[PDB]
Structure 1
Amino acid sequence: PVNPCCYYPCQHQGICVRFGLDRYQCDCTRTGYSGPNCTIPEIWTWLRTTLRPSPSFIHFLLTHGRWLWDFVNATFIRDTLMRLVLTVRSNLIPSPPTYNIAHDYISWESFSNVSYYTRILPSVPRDCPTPMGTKGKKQLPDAEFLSRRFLLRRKFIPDPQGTNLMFAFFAQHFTHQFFKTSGKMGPGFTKALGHGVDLGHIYGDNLERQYQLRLFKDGKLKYQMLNGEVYPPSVEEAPVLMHYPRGIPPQSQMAVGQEVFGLLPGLMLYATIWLREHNRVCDLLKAEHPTWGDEQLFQTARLILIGETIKIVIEEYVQQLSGYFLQLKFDPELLFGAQFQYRNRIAMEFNQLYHWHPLMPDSFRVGPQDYSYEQFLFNTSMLVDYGVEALVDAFSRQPAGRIGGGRNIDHHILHVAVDVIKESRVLRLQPFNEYRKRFGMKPYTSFQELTGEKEMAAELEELYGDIDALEFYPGLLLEKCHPNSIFGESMIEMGAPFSLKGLLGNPICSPEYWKASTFGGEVGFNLVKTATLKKLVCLNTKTCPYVSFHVPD
């Protein structure tokens, strides 16, 4: 027979279940619909559905009333929308989490084995006719081809939104504390337990590595003055694992917390900035609390950074990305009246989606210099050579690149992209269209609709044969972008629900933890309530260069 769940009969998040030898059932519990496949709207849902404006429209309101917005901004209406934006967006991520690479059903194991990345949608049944279930060709497009043909960059297409490189890295740095696929266990597993913003890419992802990094005195972290400025410590004091190439394992071979952070000045840069911050947070605290030991000073300053990060990521990172006129705001109390689980579990689909490699430019301008990938990659003096102030000022000036539209992934890194498309298949993520539904959107009816153009469109059809067959990672990049937007519709509609669920689902954001004593003192609490990119930098330097998630001018 043909495993009925292969057609994806259940709609609106209904659970498909095999019953007997060839039949199935949809569990439409709390889906808002009743019916064999959850297709009959309840009295209200019907109301909801008929009165709900398109995401297309909403994204239009948020990006146009440059007046209605300055006003809505200066009032509570701002908080109302924030509290709205949040709740609604987050209400889409099943929490407690649901499935993993091993189970396409709820299990105690899935719940408790932190190692497993979690999936929003189950996987395409190993017995389904086509690779994607029902429609498509017996073979998905050779990802080697698919890549170079549509994702390989020809002419560097800069991000119309002004995004710069200073953002490009922070983005990379920041995302590598929860995305850490285990080579050993393979796709669908993560070393980054804690699944969130625990800065385990600073303090490391294990007590030992932390200890090996911890200078167990004043709660601070180790480090070394090179040129007079503070930098991370080398393995020769911070005896901990890394990935620096076999060459000078002693000097300029720094320990950070995120094993791979030596392979690019940008990563080590920020890494330095944060460490420089932590110890800075310790200096303040210690003054406020002399009767405090090392353990406290450490943990508390950590929280002050888990805070600061969650604030900058929201009021500055997501802001820039959003392009909204609405001025996002981070105030955990906005949900104290909602039903909101304070727990997160990174998702494989949220992982793929975050592969914004096309951000990375052609070369790397640094004042008059202009390092190439060979020069840049694995370099190890650039950072201490140029100094933080300077290097920051350099990224904050060179633009990043459009992430959507297609064809804008530098060739050097284009390999990554091909592997993502290969893993996605290993994982068996359902069709791009199937994810559109799940994330409150309409399934595309044609490639011509997917893509703004006609070329890539026809050609893709030729390959996938049927729009529904189309894949997750590819569609997400081959999709037409909102005019001037850094990326298309599906990226935000799918990204935000994962992002905000993650940002606010953080324990520190809960009523329980959100007090001034959790940051010991009022001082701690304010450092979180007022963090800035500009402050994370200029408060840990000698001079204040230029820094922002967008190019000046």
Structure 2
Amino acid sequence: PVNPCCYYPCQHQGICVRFGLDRYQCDCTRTGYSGPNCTIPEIWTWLRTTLRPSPSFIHFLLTHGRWLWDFVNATFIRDTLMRLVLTVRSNLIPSPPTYNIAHDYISWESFSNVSYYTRILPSVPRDCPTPMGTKGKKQLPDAEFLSRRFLLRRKFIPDPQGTNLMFAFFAQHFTHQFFKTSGKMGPGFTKALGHGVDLGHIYGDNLERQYQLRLFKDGKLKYQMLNGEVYPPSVEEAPVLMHYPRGIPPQSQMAVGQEVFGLLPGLMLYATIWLREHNRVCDLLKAEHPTWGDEQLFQTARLILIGETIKIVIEEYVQQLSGYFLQLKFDPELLFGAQFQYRNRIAMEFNQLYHWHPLMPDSFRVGPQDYSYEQFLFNTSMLVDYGVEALVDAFSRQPAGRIGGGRNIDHHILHVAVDVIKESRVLRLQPFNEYRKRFGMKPYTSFQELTGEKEMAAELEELYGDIDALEFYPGLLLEKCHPNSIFGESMIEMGAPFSLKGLLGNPICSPEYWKASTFGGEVGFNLVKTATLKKLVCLNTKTCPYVSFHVPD
């Protein structure tokens, strides 16, 4: 019989619905296109497409000509373009969410059950001739061999954008609040039910964990004093599930919102920094409202820290990553005259996309010392030994690896990428070319056009058989890179829409929540508006070291 939806016949966000025994129909509703396969353009769509500049042209404009951008940033155009960046990107993501691992169709279970990761494109049907649809071979390339030949680091390729480990660990810390895949429920299921910037990696994904982390006085979190410095509490003081190597003494075990943070000094670094910020905010709130109870001081402080995150993420984190000459601005009031949905659901493709393990180097240089992976991983002493000040300085000076290009994942953590590709076939993600079309890009006609070179393309031509069979995750990390950039063109075009919908879709960005009273007055509101990475560290430390998302020079 053969399922007609395996060919992906519907174009431009049309929906393949199986009718009768062998036929199909495309629902081209509000797609801007008509006809059986949604290809005949409406008057406005045809006009827009011929007048639309290429995605690369827009990226070129945003990365060149300082004289124009010095002017733009000092004018109203900054706010006009930022609004355009917000609206155009985030509208590519369905809201309310559509599909999940169980349903390749809209249902109430896909809407209400927040334990699911959502998906933009439906899974490849289980009745297709090839696991990627119709094109390609019956068996996809070996996940170990594909990572070994194309992803394994032979030499450290530094990021030309000057990105450091301070960014890398921020990226990991920030993302692991909404990427919490369930080990028992399996792939496609999440434990971070907040689905965005909830800070559940500081406070906990569940209520009882939070209560266990809370000192229940002045709204503050629990903490311990080691060498005159404030650190996260021990397991004895806060009895919560923490993933530590079995046998390790409880005095060496620290307790934070996310279970996996104790395994890396870079992760527990930010956990300390943010904990110091929470209690600091409580002190400012208490001086402003001495009549407030413990519960209000905590909840008000959480929203301030949620606002501080989004501020730093957009104006510094994205600023370093995108390399835009356009000065980015966190201002929810930009969307106040627009049709925007203040909700978010984490997609599995955003999970796959955010596996930036190439960022990690060969070693971890802290001052005169150079620490290996076996010296750095699962180390429960390093954070206390050096302190926040010394480590933040050390991570801001060490270069990070280039994400795109290829052959840049250190062999110690390569197994992750292997499992990511394995998870992609379990989830049955559509080919890379299908996602290219979903995010408004032209699909690649050959492997030579993808990598931009002759060598690595020829081997991939033999393995996959066809370009329309190329997988999602390998495509993003093997795509040609414009010199000076951190990754390929697709990463920006696929990632930004998710990322902005997660940031600005946070309820605090809504007209209902974006008020002074929400953050306990003007003091709390200004802390959100003026927050910086530098102010996140140095205000919570004795001295102020070099702190940035980029290395010196």
Provide the TM-score with structure 2 as the length reference. Answer: 1.00
Aligned to 1:328: 328
CA distance in structure 1 between the aligned counterparts of 2:191 and 2:270, rounded to whole angstroms: 21
CA distance in 1, matches of 2:102, 2:482: 36
Residues 176-225 of structure 1 show CA distances to partners (whole Å, capped at 9, x for unaligned) of 00001001010000000010000000000000000000000000000001
Number of aligned pairs? 553
1:530 and 1:159 mapped to 2: Cα distance? 29
Which secondary structure does the structure 2 equivalent of 1:46 belong to?
A: helix
Distance 2:141 2:277 in 1: 47
Deviations 1:418-455 (A, max 9, x none): 00000000000000000000000000010000002111
Deviations 1:13-60 (A, max 9, x none): 000000000000000000000110100110000000000000011100
Distance in 2 (alpha carbons) for counterparts of 1:109 and 1:246: 38
Deviation at 1:324, TM superposition (A): 0.5
Task: Please list the CA deviations of residues 490-522 of structure 1 after superposition, one character each: whole Å capped at 9, or x if unmatched.
Answer: 000000000001100000000000000000110
DSSP-derived class of the 1:67 partner: helix
Distance in 2 (CA, whole Å) between partners of 1:259 and 1:252 is: 15
Shift of 1:258: 0.4
For residue 193 of structure 2, what is the aligned residue in structure 1?
193
1:487 deviates by: 0.5
Distance 2:250 2:151 in 1: 39
Cα deviation, 1:259-310, whole Å, max 9, x if unaligned, reads: 0000000000000000000000000000000010000000000000000000
* CA distance in 2: counterparts of 1:309 and 1:161, whole angstroms: 22
Range 249-258 or range 369-378, more displaced? 249-258
Q: How many angstroms apart in 2 are the aligned matches of 1:340 and 1:107?
A: 22
Counterpart-to-counterpart distance in 1, 2:143 and 2:456: 15
Determine the C-alpha separation between the residues in 2 that align with 1:111 and 1:286: 39
1:164 CA displacement: 0.2
CA distance in 2, matches of 1:199, 1:249: 28
SS in 2 for 1:16: strand
Tell me what 1:274 maps to.
Answer: 274
CA distances 1:446-495 after superposition (whole Å, capped 9, x unpaired)? 00000021111010011001001000000000001122100010000000
| Other structure's SS at 1:396 match | helix
Partners of 2:225 and 2:526 in 1: CA distance: 29
In structure 2, distance between residues paired with 1:483 and 1:452? 12
**Aligned alpha-carbon RMSD (Å):** 0.5
For 2:291, the equivalent position in structure 1 comes to 291
> What is the alpha-carbon distance in structure 1 between the residues aligned to residue 311 and residue 139 of structure 2?
45
TM-superposed deviation, 1:236: 0.8
Rounded to whole Å, the distance in 2 between the matches of 1:91 and 1:249 is 50
Shift of 1:546: 0.5
Q: Report the Cα offset of residue 66 of structure 1.
A: 1.2
> C-alpha deviations, 1:79-134, integer Å up to 9, x for none?
00000000000000000000000000000000000000000000100000001011
Cα distance in 2 for residues equivalent to 1:249 and 1:283: 33
CA distance in 2, matches of 1:35, 1:491: 31
Q: Distance in 1 between matches of 2:249 and 2:456?
A: 47
Task: Quote the residue 1:212 is aligned against.
Answer: 212
CA apart distance, 1:65: 1.4
Displacement of 1:247 in angstroms is 2.5
Alpha-carbon separation, structure 2, partners of 1:189 and 1:104? 15
Q: Aligned partners of 2:482, 2:344: CA distance in 1, in Å?
A: 29
Q: Distance in 1 between matches of 2:199 and 2:264?
A: 19
- Counterpart of 1:435 in 2: which secondary structure? helix
Give, in angstroms, the shift of residue 380 of structure 1: 0.9
Q: Distance in 2 between matches of 1:377 and 1:387?
A: 17
For the residue of structure 1 that corresponds to 2:416, the secondary structure is: helix
Matched residue, 1:404: 404
Cα deviation, residue 390, structure 1: 0.4
Counterparts of 2:482 and 2:289, CA distance in 1: 51
The 2-side partners of 1:288 and 1:367 are apart by 41
Structure 2: how far apart are the matches of 1:461 and 1:392? Answer: 44
| Partners of 1:181 and 1:174 in 2: CA distance | 15
SS at match of 1:496: helix
Give the secondary-structure state (helix, strand or coil) at the position aligned to 2:397: coil
> 1: distance between equivalents of 2:279 and 2:327?
31
Structure 1 stretches of 4+ moved >3 Å = none
Question: What is the distance in 2 between the residues matched to 1:136 and 1:452?
Answer: 21
1:2 Cα deviation (Å)?
1.0
User: Could you tell me how far apart the structure 1 residues matched to 2:67 and 2:128 are?
Assistant: 53
Identity within the alignment, %:
100
Separation of aligned partners in 1, 2:481 and 2:523: 43
Measured after TM superposition, the shift of residue 252 of structure 1 is 2.1
Identify the residue that residue 95 of structure 1 maps to in structure 2: 95
Q: Secondary structure at the match of 1:387?
A: helix
- SS of the aligned residue for 1:316 comes to helix
CA distance in 2 between counterparts of 1:174 and 1:247 reads 29
Q: Tell me, what secondary structure is at the counterpart of 2:26?
A: strand
Moved more, 65-74 or 23-32: 65-74
Bigger Cα displacement from structure 2, 476-485 vs 406-415: 476-485
User: Helix, strand or coil: the match of 1:262?
Assistant: helix
The alpha carbon displacement at 1:249 in A equals: 3.3
Q: 2 CA distance for matches of 1:67 and 1:303?
A: 38
Q: CA deviation at 1:244?
A: 1.1
Q: What is the 5 A alignment of 1:28-427? A: 28-427=28-427
**d(CA) in 2 for partners of 1:105, 1:143:** 29
Q: Secondary structure at the match of 1:216?
A: coil
Shift of 1:338: 0.5
Distance 1:87 1:168 in 2: 27
> Which whole-Å deviations, capped at 9, do the CAs of 1:334-370 have from their partners, x for residues lacking one?
0000000000000000100000000000000000011
What SS does structure 2 have at the residue aligned with 1:230? Answer: strand
Q: How big is the shift at 1:545?
A: 0.3
Tell me by how many angstroms 1:246 deviates. Answer: 1.4
What is the alpha-carbon distance in structure 2 between the residues aligned to residue 82 and residue 324 of structure 1? 12
What secondary structure, in the 3-state scheme, does the structure 1 residue paired with 2:25 have?
Answer: strand
Secondary structure of residue in 1 paired with 2:236? coil
Q: State the shift of 1:145 in Å.
A: 0.3
Mapped partners of 2:8, 2:473: distance in 1:
20
- The whole-number CA distance in structure 1 between the counterparts of 2:62 and 2:369 is 40
Partner SS state of residue 539, structure 1: helix
User: What is the TM-score normalised by the length of structure 1?
Assistant: 1.00
When structure 1 is superposed on structure 2, of 45-54 and 246-255 the one drifting more is: 246-255
CA deviations on 1:127-158 (whole Å, 9 max, x unpaired) are 00001011000000011100010000110001
Query: 2: CA distance between counterparts of 1:346 and 1:51?
Result: 32
Q: Secondary structure at the match of 1:18?
A: strand
Structure 2: state its 5+ residue gaps.
none
Counterpart secondary structure, 2:535: helix
For 1:388 and 1:484, the matched residues in 2 are separated by 31
Matched residue SS, 2:184: coil
Secondary structure of 1:487's counterpart equals coil
Q: 1: distance between equivalents of 2:422 and 2:455?
A: 24
Distance in 2 (alpha carbons) for counterparts of 1:145 and 1:419: 12
